[PDB]
Amino acid sequence: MKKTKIVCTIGPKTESEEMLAKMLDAGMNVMRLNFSHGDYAEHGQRIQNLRNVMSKTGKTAAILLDTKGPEIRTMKLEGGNDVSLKAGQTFTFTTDKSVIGNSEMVAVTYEGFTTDLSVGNTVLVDDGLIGMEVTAIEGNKVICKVLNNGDLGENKGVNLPGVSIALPALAEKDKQDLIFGCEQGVDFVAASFIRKRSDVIEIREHLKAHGGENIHIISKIENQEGLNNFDEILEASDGIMVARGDLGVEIPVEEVIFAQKMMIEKCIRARKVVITATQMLDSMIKNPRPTRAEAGDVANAILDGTDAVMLSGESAKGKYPLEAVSIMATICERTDRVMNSRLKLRITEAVCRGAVETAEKLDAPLIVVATQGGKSARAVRKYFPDATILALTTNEKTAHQLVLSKGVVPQLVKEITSTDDFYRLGKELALQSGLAHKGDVVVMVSGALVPSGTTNTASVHVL
Amino acid sequence: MKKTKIVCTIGPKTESEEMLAKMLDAGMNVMRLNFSHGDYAEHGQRIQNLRNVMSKTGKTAAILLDTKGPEIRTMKLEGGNDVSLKAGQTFTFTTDKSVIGNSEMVAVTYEGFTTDLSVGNTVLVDDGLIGMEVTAIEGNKVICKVLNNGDLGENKGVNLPGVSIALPALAEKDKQDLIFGCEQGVDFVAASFIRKRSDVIEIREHLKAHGGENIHIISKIENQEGLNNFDEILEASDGIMVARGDLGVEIPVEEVIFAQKMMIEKCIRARKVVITATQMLDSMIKNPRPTRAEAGDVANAILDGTDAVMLSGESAKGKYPLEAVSIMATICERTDRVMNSRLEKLRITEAVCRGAVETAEKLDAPLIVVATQGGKSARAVRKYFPDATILALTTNEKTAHQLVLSKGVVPQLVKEITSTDDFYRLGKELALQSGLAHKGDVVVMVSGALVPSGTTNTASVHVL
Amino acid sequence: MKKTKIVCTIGPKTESEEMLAKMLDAGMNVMRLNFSHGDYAEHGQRIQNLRNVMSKTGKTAAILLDTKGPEIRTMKLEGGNDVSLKAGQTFTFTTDKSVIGNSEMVAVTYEGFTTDLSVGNTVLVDDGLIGMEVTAIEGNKVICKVLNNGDLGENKGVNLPGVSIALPALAEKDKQDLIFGCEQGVDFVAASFIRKRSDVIEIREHLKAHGGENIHIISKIENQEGLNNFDEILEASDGIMVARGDLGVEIPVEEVIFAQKMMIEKCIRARKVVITATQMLDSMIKNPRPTRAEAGDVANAILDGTDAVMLSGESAKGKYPLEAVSIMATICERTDRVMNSRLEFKLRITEAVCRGAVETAEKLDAPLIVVATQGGKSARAVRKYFPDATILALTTNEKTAHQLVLSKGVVPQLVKEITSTDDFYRLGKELALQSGLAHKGDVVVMVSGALVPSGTTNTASVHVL
Amino acid sequence: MKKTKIVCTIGPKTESEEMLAKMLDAGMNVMRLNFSHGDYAEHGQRIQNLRNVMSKTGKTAAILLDTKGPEIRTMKLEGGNDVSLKAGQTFTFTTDKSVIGNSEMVAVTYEGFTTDLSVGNTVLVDDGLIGMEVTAIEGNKVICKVLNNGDLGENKGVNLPGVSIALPALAEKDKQDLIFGCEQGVDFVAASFIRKRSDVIEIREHLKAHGGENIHIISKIENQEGLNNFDEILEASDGIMVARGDLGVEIPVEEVIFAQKMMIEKCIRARKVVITATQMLDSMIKNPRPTRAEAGDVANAILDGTDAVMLSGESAKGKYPLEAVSIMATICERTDRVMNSRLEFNRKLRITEAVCRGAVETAEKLDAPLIVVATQGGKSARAVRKYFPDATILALTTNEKTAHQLVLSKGVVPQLVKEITSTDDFYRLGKELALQSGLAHKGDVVVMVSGALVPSGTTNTASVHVL
């Protein structure tokens, strides 16, 4: 009876129908396809396997495509050997991709490394392992002074704290991956390294161009620029993914937690899904139990008010995926049990808030919602109702998409002819769902005599 | 645009169709038929006239039948001449008509004055003018001691606080009047001499016996016993009439105010209509303008939260009825203008209606449209004193008439309401058509869906 | 056990020490001296009598001087007989006093009757008995049309609804009446027919000139102009008296109670005393019992949140004064019994501390709030929030001790001196026990001003008796 | 601008006065002396050094003594070499010390290991590295089945989840350490492995017996039994230390989070100090920067409402003590910056509660940047602190111990005064010191809280002043 949802990164070890079924049973709600690794055949087969399991078992789940995204990385070294960098030495970055790199200098993939950077800026290498301060920028070169000792290797990630990185919204591979996403008919697209509105709009147009207009865009906030432009990004997006690990490398350490809480809170207010990802249960990639701190982080993330929590590497390429999903689910359950509701504003707001409040007054274990796009369910969900949300819809895509929202059980129905019919059918399905029984009060929310996008009716019934 | 309703007692001076129309224009909402004096031809004609005015103008109104009830009075004295009494002496009451007695002893009209009464009880005469306490009970006589000086007159009213008089709520005249009421198909019956729940039940039974089961009973609280059993009387009744003047004769002046307020509050809580009736604008029976104290009293009575106010004598046999109704209406509007909403085992109806008013208030909705069969939903919404006017759609004419007595509700008779969506459509149409709301205004729409009649469970917000 | 205070107009039947004692026992708190009637010897004797009763019994009370004020009256008629006026006729008012007046015309005392009035204005005579509409104004005459039939007599009051009457704030006798008041050392001055702030300023300035600077001025709102300019009058005044009867003839009838309610509300907020006065229990002048409506009126006036209620004629020249005071006290008690506190959600320190004091007192079930005051401000500041607890006011100022008698739910106590805050707590606790209003074990909240002059209240302390 | 206090475990890296001074500048408020290691001369030297720094700089600080406590540990192995235990094997624990231990069996130091433990119970070894399931208990032996592969070594700690361990409240060394604590006149004593009220009482009596009655006892909750008896333990104690690391091996992991939050909450209500300890910034033992997760953990611990946060190892034997204290202080400042007041809104509460709540409320209402408090024992300051006032608490006291001890309470600045003769005197002196502190300025509103005409333990008067 947990409400917060679980996104599971599926890989070679958990792609089989058996494992997927066990994963769904364990508490999995959404399959993440990390396009940082794999080819189309694999991902396609995972999709097919999952949906067949879904078809066979009658279990519900969503499919999310996570792009690799554009990134600045170092390149090849002399003889393929790592080098050791010392503190205080003159290190240089060149934008020439033909350059093989040694101690003194290395090449980067980004053609704007010289342009975007300024003298005094910080350059981090290999997930913040090695830090450098730019001393000079000349021609195609960026001359820096090393701040700390460390060993540089091949193809390491580069982070530029507080720097606006003129990279495209989509790498060329990402564009093709999105087309694949449209072909497969995924429910979500998690766009990596979103820094501004134009990026999201570009994602949207790219989708639109290949019949993916109904696919929801989850903007991944990974650095300061994206955090600064969070409002427009959120307004333009259908959801947000809080990437703590990257933020930990991009912004001051003491600020990440408030970025998470702030983004979660704003996501909650906007009735849009939010996912807290990375650095979740990483220790369980090799161990059968997570550490206390991890459980704490996850629990607190749930208490912040997250729609979903994500497993990355634990469930994909880890030695104990089911254990991770299981303990994650227990944490979810334990945390959800003790959370309470949070009670010019418009119709939808007043009606949904009033519906939750009314539900709370009458000890209703269920709030049934008639939805076409999924907006009403999220509108009711906004207030963290004690009641489970039974979202009845004739749209599979939204039915799938609602799987990601907290505390909502979506259900596909043939048709809803009217409001009274919705009440009848809703009562029937409310009893059929097993979430409520005879004698229980149920609150029923819908849009009457209005187009989609407005919630204005609330009705109380006894089962 | 007043919310509080005005009940007007109609008499020969105000029975005409033109005058009734003028009275309706002035602010009249309900016609009171005081059967304390008059015949069936008059009242019937009054009813017919009102209904004619209603038919021609398209104006809505209710008809209230007020029973006279039984009374204990003193009897005949020497030569039809006045007399005089003394304090501290031995006054005696006998259950014997033939006995005449100016002082020392007196006869009463009620057979069993000796029987029901007990030693220690108080006997009041002429609206509490003279009080005495029962000293002993023997045979056909009961000796009492006078507590205060006063002059006794011919055939004066008698009050017995806390004493069960054991007379029925209805005499043969009241019974026939009530049957007449059922025949005429009146909307309300204001029952006199209600002391306890059984009295109300008897009225109900008499009604039901003549096809008046849907007629609402307004119980008149006019005595101490009725005040003690107010809860049961209220539970059994459809509404209450607060008779301050009559209570003033049975209880201390210091308790009447809070008795009124308490009865009004409890009536409001129970979704039962309440009427403040006696000593309203009595001076306007003789004068064209009321006194400050009266207007103040009325205003405070409205502020207490009464559904309606009654003119009794001002509108019936007074020289300035139209003026009284007018100034009453101005007072009503003026008082209603500055009143705020009053938000609140808790059930559905309560939660939905309260939530509906709250939602209406939050969104600046000028109208709350309500679907009603029995009228309970409109009254349930009214309970919270909505700033918005209640537009009550019903297929029941009786309730449509009866809702005229409830505060801030405009009843509307419709042919049919087939469903909830149909109710929303028709409600929007009539909301616009009524002129109380226009394009752009939000309206909250309240009804019962897939539930019995007496239950309200749906609230929906729409834009016109 | 009542909180609402009772002002009683004293006359020949209640002028004796015995009756005054009885009146105090019945529930009287303040003596009103209506200088519309009486001479200086009489009023002086009343004052002396009250002070004697107070000295002998040891009970506390206040003395209020009510001025007559300026008046517009009609004058004498032919043969000293009333005349009967008919509606629609031509009645004229003349400024020539020497004129004896008949049906057609009568003289008035005010020489600006033509100036202040305009065509269309209403002229009322004898407490709204006779109404007239101004048709024309010529020379020293005001030509009017009678609206209703009535008998006009000699020396009748004239009322002008909604008309600004350019009469002075003080009549010639009133100055000497106030001087007498200062000499006698009265506690309050009730000024009649206050229409504007300047009037209050004039009274205050006059009192200031004769050692009456410490006397509180209560402005009587009796007409449209005074009501329209109520805020400035309240700001300028120390208190207000709501004259319903006088307002009732001056403003629309449906507006009188909301004027009362509005004015009472503002007085409490301003921490100034308010008195609900005229048309209280007048029926008890001839009858031994009040009417229901009157009792209702008193109760509602108290429920509005008035500090005190006034008897005018009931207590002076009525057949049943003691009965009136008694039933008044009973009504006060019955109404006060069911009133609760008003704990908001401008305001400053004093407000915050006093509000907090009441809050804490009620939170801890304290039946008593002891307050140290020099001017009486802290007690009224605490009183503003209608504490369930009785307010015990300690003072080294006799005048404030007298004046606090009018404030609701305040028991004044004259103390020798208050040397410090701890000393105040000690003395307050002691006197709290001595008062008998509190007992051993009871919690008491103690409010005072620490390290600040006598105009701000900043300390609140909780003690157990 | 931070209100949350920082407890720093001092070691070889931070034992000098210079380092102590820098540590105080960095944000250190309390020195923790971990008696799991060291001798009296060393700790004494540490105390002397801190007190010297305090004497020279005029800075205030507290000294907290952390006991090693009793423990169940394994004993010696063959040749001093690790042995490898495999999953599914029959392992045995013996109460015979003289036994040197191999792959099959090892001895434990605790004699009631046989008695307290039962069949089915779990046995964890070496900080939960190796887990075993008890299959049978015979004689002096406890037969168990190993659940996971692992290497067992010499002198490793043993944890018994959910087991009531009849160990004494105080080890023999702890007692002499406490006597030393009394000798040195420490401000706090952190008692290890508290499971029940009696344990607290024993320590209290032991202190009392050696003139340490004014020393505050912080009960360290490290297992389920202590968590079960938390209320009475808190009742008997002056404060609590939430040992998350120890809890993580003793109770279900998903329960640890709410145990921390629950205990912080109850400590706040009880007007007693609470310290969130262990697994704070451990990564900084090796690195110059903490992990995001660590900062998050600390921040949330502060947001839960802990009075203080504790460094253990970061400040003692780490390569980056200053960095750890500094970033810790930064976290404290950043987190404290955005916290709001928590005003009550359990049926009946008394005077002190009403006065203090009302004082904070009034303080907030008038935008008072400072609340001055008169205290003898520190209860009033802690009583005011309960509501997390935005205003700083300036605590005036004639008690040196209380001045020192209040350094641990959140958002309170203690000040030692010679005398307070009366309430007006307190207002005068308080206003003076309020101005002198630089925490308030001319014109600013100050709320002044104290006990007037009442014994110690009672706060009953609150007064508003303009400086």
Curated annotation (Swiss-Prot), chain A:
Enzyme Commission no: 2.7.1.40
Q: Where does K(+) bind?
A: 34, 36, 66-67
**Alphabetized CDD domains for the sequence:** Pyruvate_Kinase
In this UniProt entry, the residues modified to N6-acetyllysine are 76, 319
Q: InterPro entries, from UniProt?
A: Pyr_Knase, Pyrv/PenolPyrv_kinase-like_dom, Pyrv_kinase-like_dom_sf, Pyrv_Knase-like_insert_dom_sf, Pyrv_Knase_AS, Pyrv_Knase_brl, Pyrv_Knase_C, Pyrv_Knase_C_sf
* Residues engaged in binding ATP: 34-37, 73, 156
Q: Where is this site: Transition state stabilizer?
A: 220
By its UniProt entry, which PROSITE patterns does this protein fall under? PYRUVATE_KINASE
Pathways per UniProt: Carbohydrate degradation; glycolysis; pyruvate from D-glyceraldehyde 3-phosphate: step 5/5
Q: What are the record keywords, sorted?
A: Acetylation, ATP-binding, Glycolysis, Kinase, Magnesium, Metal-binding, Nucleotide-binding, Potassium, Pyruvate, Transferase
Q: Which GO terms describe its molecular function?
A: ATP binding; kinase activity; magnesium ion binding; potassium ion binding; pyruvate kinase activity
* Group of enzyme by EC: transferase
Q: Catalytic activity annotated for this protein?
A: pyruvate + ATP = phosphoenolpyruvate + ADP + H(+)
Binding residue positions for substrate: 32, 245-246, 278
Write down the SUPFAM superfamilies for this protein, in alphabetical order.
Answer: Phosphoenolpyruvate/pyruvate domain, PK beta-barrel domain-like, PK C-terminal domain-like
On whether Amino-acid biosynthesis is a keyword of this UniProt record, the answer is no
Q: Which residues bind Mg(2+)?
A: 222, 246
According to the record's subunit comment, the protein's assembly and interactions are: Homotetramer.
Checking NCBIfam families in the record gives: PRK05826.1, PRK06354.1, PRK09206.1, pyruv_kin
The name on file for this protein is Pyruvate kinase I
Q: Which organism is it from?
A: Escherichia coli O157:H7
What gene is it encoded by? pykF
